[PDB]
From a paper:
Mitochondrial ribosomes (mitoribosomes) play the central and ubiquitous role of synthesising mitochondrial proteins which are essential for the survival of almost all eukaryotes including parasites. We resolved the complete mitoribosome structure with map resolutions of the large and small ribosomal subunits (LSU and SSU) ranging from 2.2 to 2.8 Å. The result of these analyses reveals a total of 53 rRNA molecules, markedly exceeding the previously predicted level of fragmentation.
The 32 LSU and 21 SSU rRNA molecules are extremely short, ranging from 278 to just seven nucleotides. While the remaining fragments of h44 are scaffolded by helical repeat proteins, they do not directly contribute to subunit interactions. Subunit association is instead mediated via rRNA through an SSU expansion segment h31-ES1, and via a protein heterodimer with transcriptional-activator-PC4-like (PC4) domains, mS135 and mS136 (one of two heterodimers seen in this mitoribosome). The PC4-like heterodimer is positioned on the top of the SSU head, poised for interactions with the CP, and associates tightly with a strand of nucleic acid. Two proteins are lost (uS4m and uS7m), and one (uS3m) is heavily reduced, retaining only a small fragment corresponding to the ciliate mS92. The missing uS3m binding site is occupied by several terminal extensions from surrounding proteins without detectable sequence similarities or structural convergences (uS14m, mS92 and mS134), while uS7m is replaced by a tandem ApiAP2-domain containing protein, mS130.
Residue numbers in the entry:
A (entry chain Yk): 208 to 298, 339 to 396, 417 to 444, 449 to 487, 510 to 530, 546 to 566, 585
B (entry chain BC): 144 to 182, 230 to 411, 447 to 476, 497 to 536, 573 to 591, 597 to 621, 630 to 676
C (entry chain Bt): 11 to 135, 174 to 208, 239 to 289
D (entry chain By): 75 to 124
E (entry chain Yk): 1167 to 1253, 1302 to 1367, 1426 to 1462
The structure:
RNA sequence: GGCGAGAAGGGAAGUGUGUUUCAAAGAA
RNA sequence: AUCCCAGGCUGA
RNA sequence: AAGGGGAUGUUUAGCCGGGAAAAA
C-alpha cells in the first residue's frame, strides 16, 4: 500500500514497468490530483505493457473516463504494432487479444457525433491503421476480433465491415507474397493450419453488408473511416470480401492437401 | 387502517415541511448535494446531509396510492420551481417505479413520452418491459404498439431485439382477425429488418408459423395464398440471416443434392429442419394445385435424436403441421373433366403417401411424445 | 374593469422575492415615469428573458400530471425558443443546423404599433440566412435555459416554407453563443451524414388504424 | 373603396393636394400621410420596388 | 426502508423539529440488515448470500424476467389454442395456468417496483471522483498535453499513433451535448 | 436591448437669491 | 454565504 | 425465449467582481 502522493510521484516508473493500475486500485482514496495525473499519463503515453493492458479498460470504466478523445488515444496505442503487445498465435507471456476486446463490452464513449461504445472506436482505429499491418498482424487482429473466448447491434454492421476489409487485405497481401519466398518459408504447416482455422470462423453465410453497396444517399458517418480505408486500398492496390474468403480458403486447403 | 393513516399523515407532513422550508430563505434550504473531497477522514463530509432530492425520494417511499402519487408530483413540482432538481438515472427510474407502484400506467406512458423535455435520462429498460407486461395483462396489447413506437423513435432508448419480440407477440395477440394480426406483426418485423436489427429466432418462428397456419387454412378449400407463402419464405430467410448475425455478434437432381448437403452438414437443428420441410411441402402443394420435403422431415427427426443424445428459439412441432399431415393421411378415396378428376386423385394419393411417410418418421422422432396417439383423428371425427 | 400590469412573479429555479409596496421609484408623484425593468405585458411585446418569462408554475395536485412538466418543450412555434427546441432533439440538437425565421414575431402582427410607417413602404412582394450548429451544450434549467456554443455561418435557404441547402456558404465564427436564442421561431435540419441509430426514422404507421 | 370612389382617376390621386385629401370623407391623418408618402415614392421610382 | 412512527413524530411534527433533525432521514446500507433477505432468497452455503440492497434488486430482477417470459409463453399458447378453437380440456387447463401465471407475474412486478422505490439511493462504495471532477480532469489533461506540444513547437510508434488519430478524428469535431459543468476553456502554462 | 423623458417645479434660502467685473486645456 | 450572473480567471 | 430485461453509474474545488431577498 503506497500513499497517493508517492503513487503519483512514481507513476512514471510504474507505467514503464507495467505495475501502475494495480497500485492505483490499491490506493486508499482517489482524489482529483491522482485522477489528473493518471489521465495526463494516459494521454501523453498511451502505451502500456503487461497486466496494465488488461487493467486499463476496467480502470477506465470504474473511474468513468469515457471521453472519446482519450478512448481513441488508448485504443490507437493498443492497436499500433499489436504483435509487440499481444499474444501472436503463430509460432513474458503477452496476453491474448480476445480478452482485450471482451474487456471493452461496457465502456461507452462520449462527445462523438456517431459512436457510443469503445468497440466502434477500436474498429475505426484498426481500419485507419489497416494499410500498415503485416500479414501476421492482420491475422492476429482478425483472430482476436472473431475469437470465441456481446457487441452492440449499432456496432455490429461496423464490425462486419471491418471483418470484410481485413479479409480483403489479407487476401491482397498473400497474393502479393526473395523476401516473399522468405515469408512463405516462415509460413510453415502450423501457421497455415492456424490461418485456415481462423478463416473457417467466417467461412459460411457471408454477411449481407458485404454484398451491400458499401463494397460495390450519402454514406452515413458511422462508416466514414471504413470508407476511407476502402478508398485507400482500392487506389493503392475489384475483389469482393466473399471472393476473398473463397480464395483464402482454397489456397489454404490446397497448401494443406499438398498431434 | 391505523398504519395506512399514519403513513399518509407522514407523507403529507413531509411534503408540507419541504414546502415551508422552501418558503424560508435560501440559506436555510437543504443543500443541493453533500460535498466533495478536498472541499474516517477520507469518508468525512461525503454523504452527511439530506439533500432536497433525497428528502423528496424519502417522502415518495411513503406513497402507495393513486392519491399519494399526486403528493409525489407536488414534491417534484416544488423541486422544479425552486431549482433543487438534478435529473439523473436515479430520478428517472424512481419516478417510473413510483408511477407503476401507485398503479398509474397512464402516468407511466406520459412520463415515457414527456421525459425528453425536462429530464436528463430515460427510464430503465426493465421498467419499460414491465410497462409492456402490464399493458398485456390489462387486455390491451395494442398499447404495446404505441409504447414500442415511442421507444424506437426516442434516440436515448437503445434498440433491443427483446422489445421487438414482445411487440411482435403482442401484435399477434391483438383481439382482431388473424390476418390483420399477422399483418401488424409483419409491419413490426419489416421495421426491424429495415433498421438492421437481428431479431431472435423465436420472432421469425412465430411469423412463419402464423403464415403457414393461414396458408393451410386457405388451402383447406387480407393476404392471398401466394402472399402467405412469400411472407413465410422471406421470414425464414431472415431467420437464417439473423441467426448467422447473432452468432457473429456473440462469437430429381436437386433432390439428390439434398442428400449430399445433409451428409456434409455439420449438425442441423431439428426445429429449423421441421419448418423448412413444412415450407417445402407447402410450396410443392401450392405448385401442384396451380398446375422432397420427406427428406427434410427425416433429417429433422434424425437431428432431434442427435440433440437428445448430446438457443433462444421456440421448441416444438407445429400443431398446424400435425393437423395438415393427419388430414392428408386421412385422404378419402372418394375425395377432359374425367381426366382432370383422375389427375386430382393421383395427386391426392401422392399427398397421402407423403403424409403417411411423414407420420412414420415422426413416430420414431423425438417429437412423438408430444403427439398423443389417435388424437388428431378423433378431433377430426368429432 | 381595467387592464393593469400583471402581478410580478419569480422565475422557475429561483427562491421567492419579497417585492415592493409601490409600483416604481417615483410613485405617485411622477405618474409618467417608466422603469427600464418594467415587465412588458401589453400585446405585441416579448417578456424579458429570465426576469418575467418562465414564471413559477403552480397547479392544484388534482390536475398535476407528468405532461404538466413538458409545457416549455410543447410551447408553440412562435414562442418556443432555441433551448426548448434543442432539449428533445437527437444529441440535444448538436451537429445539426438551426436558423430563425422572425416572420411570426408577436410585434410584427399584434399591438397598437404593429402597423406604422416604414422607411421603405408597404409590402407587395431563396435567401441567405444565418446558420448555427451547436457543439457545446449545458442546461442550467431544463429545457429553457442553457449555455450553448457553436459554429455561426452564412447558409442558403430555398424553396421547399423554406429548406436549408448549403449551411456553409461562408465561414463565420467557430464558437459563439446562439444568436436570438432567447425567443423566436427556430427551424432545424439534421446533418447530411446522419446515422439512423441516432436520428430514428419514423415508426411505420398502422395499416388499419382501428378505433 | 370609398377613398377610391372619391378619387376618380390615378392622375387625380397623384396630383391631389393635402386639402383635397382632408376634404375626402372618412380619411384620417395617418391615411393621408401614408397616401402622400407612397405617391411620392412611386413618382420617384422607389416603390413598389422597395 | 420506510419511516417509522418514532421518526414521523420526532422530525415530521413541525418545521423547527424537521430542521433540527432532518439529517436522520438518510437511509444508507448501514441502516439495513440482510439476514431475512438471505433467508427468503435461500442462498444456502456455499452461496454468497445477500450483502446489499442492490443484490436484492438483482435477484428480484432475475425472478421477474423468468416469470414475465413464462407469462408471455403462456399467453402465446392461449392465443394458439384460441386459433384452434376458431378453426375442452385445453382451455380447462389454460384457465388455471393463466390464472397462476398472471398472479405470479403481478407479484414479481410489484416486488420489482417496491424494490426500486424503497432501496436507498446509490452512492459510490469508495472515495472517488464525481462526474464533474472526471470531466474537468479530462479537459485539463488534454489542455496540458496541448500546451506541452505548443511548448515543444522509438518515436516511430508515437508518430504512427498520431497519424491514426488524425485519420480517425471526426471531420466536424467534438460534439459535447451532455456537459456536466458549464462550458469552459481550460488552459495550462505548458 | 439602446437613447430621451420634472404637467417644464416658485415647496428652501436676507445678507440669501440674483446682478456687475473676471477666469476656466486637452494630446501634460 | 451560496439564490442568480449572456461576468470572469485559475488547478501538473 | 435457461442465459444482455445483464453490468457501470457521490456532488468539480477555489478567488475576484456585480445583483436580489433575509438581517442590519
Amino acid at each position: 500500500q503506497l500513499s497517493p502522493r508517492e503513487f503519483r510521484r512514481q507513476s512514471l516508473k510504474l507505467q514503464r514497468q507495467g505495475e501502475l493500475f494495480g497500485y492505483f486500485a490499491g490506493l486508499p482514496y482517489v482524489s482529483w490530483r491522482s485522477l489528473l495525473r493518471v489521465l495526463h499519463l494516459l494521454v501523453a503515453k498511451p502505451f502500456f505493457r503487461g497486466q496494465d493492458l488488461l487493467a486499463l479498460p476496467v480502470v477506465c470504466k470504474r473511474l468513468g473516463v469515457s471521453d472519446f478523445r482519450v478512448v481513441d488515444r488508448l485504443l490507437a496505442g493498443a492497436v499500433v504494432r499489436p504483435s509487440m503487445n499481444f499474444a501472436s498465435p503463430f509460432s513474458k507471456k503477452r496476453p491474448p487479444f480476445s480478452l482485450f476486446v471482451a474487456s471493452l463490452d461496457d465502456w461507452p464513449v462520449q462527445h462523438h457525433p456517431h459512436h457510443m461504445h469503445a468497440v466502434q472506436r477500436l474498429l475505426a482505429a484498426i481500419c485507419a491503421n489497416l494499410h500498415n499491418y503485416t500479414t501476421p498482424d492482420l491475422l492476429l487482429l482478425f483472430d482476436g476480433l472473431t475469437a470465441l473466448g456481446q457487441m452492440p447491434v449499432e456496432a455490429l454492421e461496423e464490425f462486419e465491415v471491418t471483418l470484410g476489409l481485413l479479409l480483403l487485405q489479407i487476401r491482397a497481401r498473400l497474393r502479393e507474397g526473395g523476401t516473399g519466398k522468405d515469408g512463405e518459408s516462415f509460413f510453415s504447416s502450423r501457421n497455415v493450419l492456424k490461418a485456415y482455422e481462423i478463416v473457417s470462423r467466417v467461412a459460411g453465410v457471408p454477411p449481407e453488408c458485404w454484398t451491400s453497396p458499401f463494397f460495390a444517399e450519402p454514406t452515413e458517418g458511422q462508416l466514414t473511416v471504413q470508407k476511407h480505408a476502402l478508398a485507400k486500398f482500392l487506389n493503392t492496390s475489384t475483389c469482393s470480401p466473399v471472393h476473398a474468403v473463397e480464395d483464402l480458403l482454397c489456397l489454404l486447403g490446397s497448401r494443406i492437401l499438398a498431434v | 387502517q391505523a398504519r395506512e393513516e399514519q403513513r399518509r399523515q407522514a407523507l403529507k407532513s413531509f411534503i408540507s415541511r419541504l414546502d415551508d422550508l422552501f418558503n424560508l430563505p435560501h440559506q436555510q434550504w437543504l443543500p443541493l448535494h453533500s460535498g466533495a473531497p478536498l472541499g474516517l477522514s477520507p469518508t468525512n463530509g461525503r454523504d452527511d446531509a439530506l439533500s432536497a432530492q433525497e428528502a423528496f425520494l424519502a417522502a415518495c417511499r411513503l406513497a402507495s396510492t393513486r392519491g399519494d402519487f399526486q403528493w409525489c408530483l407536488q414534491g417534484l413540482n416544488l423541486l422544479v420551481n425552486f431549482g433543487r432538481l438534478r435529473p439523473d438515472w436515479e430520478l428517472s427510474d424512481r419516478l417510473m417505479a413510483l408511477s407503476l407502484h401507485c398503479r398509474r400506467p397512464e402516468q407511466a406512458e406520459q412520463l415515457l413520452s414527456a421525459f425528453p423535455h425536462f429530464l436528463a435520462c430515460p427510464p430503465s429498460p426493465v421498467l419499460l418491459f414491465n410497462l409492456i407486461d402490464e399493458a398485456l395483462a390489462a387486455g390491451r396489447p395494442q398499447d404495446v404498439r404505441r409504447i414500442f413506437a415511442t421507444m424506437r423513435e426516442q434516440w436515448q432508448l437503445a434498440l433491443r431485439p427483446a422489445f421487438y419480440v414482445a411487440a411482435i407477440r403482442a401484435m399477434l395477440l391483438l383481439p382482431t382477425s388473424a390476418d390483420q394480426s399477422l399483418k401488424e406483426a409483419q409491419l413490426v418485423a419489416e421495421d426491424a429488418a429495415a433498421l438492421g436489427v437481428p431479431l431472435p429466432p423465436v420472432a421469425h418462428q412465430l411469423l412463419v408459423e402464423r403464415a403457414l397456419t393461414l396458408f393451410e387454412e386457405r388451402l383447406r378449400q387480407c393476404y392471398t395464398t401466394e402472399e402467405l407463402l412469400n411472407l413465410a419464405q422471406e421470414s425464414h430467410n431472415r431467420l437464417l440471416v439473423d441467426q448467422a448475425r447473432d452468432a457473429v455478434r456473440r462469437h430429381r437432381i436437386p433432390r439428390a443434392e439434398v442428400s449430399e448437403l445433409f451428409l456434409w452438414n455439420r449438425a442441423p437443428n431439428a426445429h429449423l429442419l421441421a419448418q423448412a420441410a413444412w415450407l417445402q411441402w407447402a410450396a410443392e402443394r401450392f405448385a401442384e394445385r396451380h398446375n422432397s420435403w420427406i427428406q427434410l422431415l427425416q433429417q429433422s427427426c434424425s437431428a432431434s435424436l442427435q440433440e437428445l443424445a448430446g438457443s433462444s428459439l421456440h421448441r416444438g412441432l407445429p400443431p398446424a403441421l400435425l393437423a395438415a399431415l393427419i388430414r392428408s393421411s386421412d385422404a378419402s378415396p372418394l375425395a377432359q373433366k374425367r381426366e382432370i378428376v383422375l389427375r386430382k386423385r393421383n395427386v391426392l394419393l401422392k399427398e397421402r403417401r407423403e403424409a403417411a411417410q411423414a407420420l412414420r418418421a415422426l413416430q420414431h422422432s423425438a417429437f412423438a411424445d408430444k403427439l398423443p396417439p389417435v388424437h388428431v383423428l378423433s378431433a377430426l371425427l368429432r | 374593469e381595467k387592464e393593469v400590469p400583471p402581478p410580478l412573479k419569480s422565475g422557475i429555479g429561483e427562491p421567492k422575492k419579497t417585492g415592493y409596496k409601490f409600483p416604481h421609484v417615483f410613485f405617485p408623484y411622477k405618474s409618467r415615469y417608466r422603469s427600464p425593468h418594467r415587465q412588458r405585458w401589453w400585446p405585441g411585446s416579448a417578456p424579458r428573458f429570465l426576469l418575467h418569462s418562465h414564471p413559477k408554475r403552480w397547479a392544484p395536485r388534482r390536475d398535476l400530471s407528468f405532461a404538466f412538466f413538458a409545457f416549455h418543450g410543447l410551447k408553440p412555434f412562435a414562442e418556443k425558443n432555441l433551448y426548448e427546441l434543442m432539449h428533445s432533439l437527437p444529441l440535444r440538437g448538436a451537429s445539426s443546423f438551426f436558423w430563425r425565421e422572425a416572420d411570426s414575431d408577436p410585434w410584427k402582427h399584434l399591438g397598437r404599433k404593429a402597423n406604422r410607417l416604414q422607411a421603405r413602404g408597404v409590402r407587395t412582394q431563396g435567401r441567405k440566412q444565418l446558420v448555427f450548429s451547436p457543439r457545446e451544450i449545458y442546461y442550467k434549467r431544463r429545457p429553457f435555459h442553457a449555455l450553448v456554443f457553436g459554429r455561426l455561418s452564412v447558409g442558403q435557404l430555398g424553396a421547399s416554407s423554406r429548406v436549408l441547402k448549403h449551411p456553409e456558404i461562408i465561414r463565420g465564427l467557430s464558437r459563439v453563443a446562439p444568436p436570438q436564442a432567447s425567443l423566436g421561431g427556430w427551424k432545424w435540419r439534421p446533418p447530411k451524414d446522419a446515422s439512423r441509430w441516432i436520428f430514428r426514422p419514423k415508426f411505420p404507421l398502422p395499416f388499419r388504424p382501428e378505433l | 373603396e370609398d377613398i377610391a370612389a372619391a378619387f376618380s382617376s390615378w392622375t387625380d390621386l397623384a396630383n391631389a393636394t393635402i386639402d383635397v385629401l382632408q376634404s375626402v370623407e372618412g380619411m384620417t391623418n395617418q391615411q393621408r400621410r401614408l397616401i402622400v408618402k407612397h405617391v411620392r415614392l412611386y413618382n420617384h421610382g422607389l416603390w413598389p420596388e422597395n | 426502508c420506510r419511516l417509522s412512527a418514532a421518526q414521523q413524530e420526532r422530525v415530521l411534527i413541525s418545521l423547527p423539529q424537521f430542521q433540527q433533525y432532518n439529517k436522520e432521514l438518510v437511509l444508507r446500507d448501514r441502516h439495513l440488515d440482510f439476514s431475512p433477505f438471505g433467508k427468503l432468497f435461500n442462498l444456502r452455503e456455499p452461496a454468497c448470500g445477500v450483502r446489499t440492497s442492490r443484490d436484492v434488486l438483482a435477484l428480484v430482477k432475475v425472478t421477474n424476467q423468468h416469470v414475465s417470459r413464462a407469462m408471455a409463453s403462456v399467453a402465446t399458447l392461449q392465443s394458439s389454442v384460441q386459433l384452434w378453437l376458431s378453426e375442452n380440456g385445453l382451455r380447462n387447463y389454460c384457465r388455471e395456468l393463466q390464472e397462476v401465471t398472471e398472479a405470479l407475474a403481478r407479484s414479481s412486478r410489484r416486488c420489482l417496483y417496491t424494490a426500486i422505490v424503497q432501496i436507498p439511493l446509490r452512492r459510490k462504495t469508495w472515495v472517488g471522483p464525481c462526474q464533474g471532477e472526471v470531466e474537468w480532469a479530462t479537459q485539463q489533461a488534454l489542455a496540458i498535453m496541448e500546451a506541452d506540444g505548443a511548448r515543444d513547437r522509438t518515436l516511430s510508434k508515437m508518430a504512427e499513433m498520431n497519424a491514426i488519430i488524425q485519420c480517425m478524428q471526426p471531420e466536424r469535431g467534438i460534439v459535447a451535448w451532455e456537459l456536466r459543468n458549464p462550458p469552459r476553456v481550460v488552459t495550462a502554462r505548458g
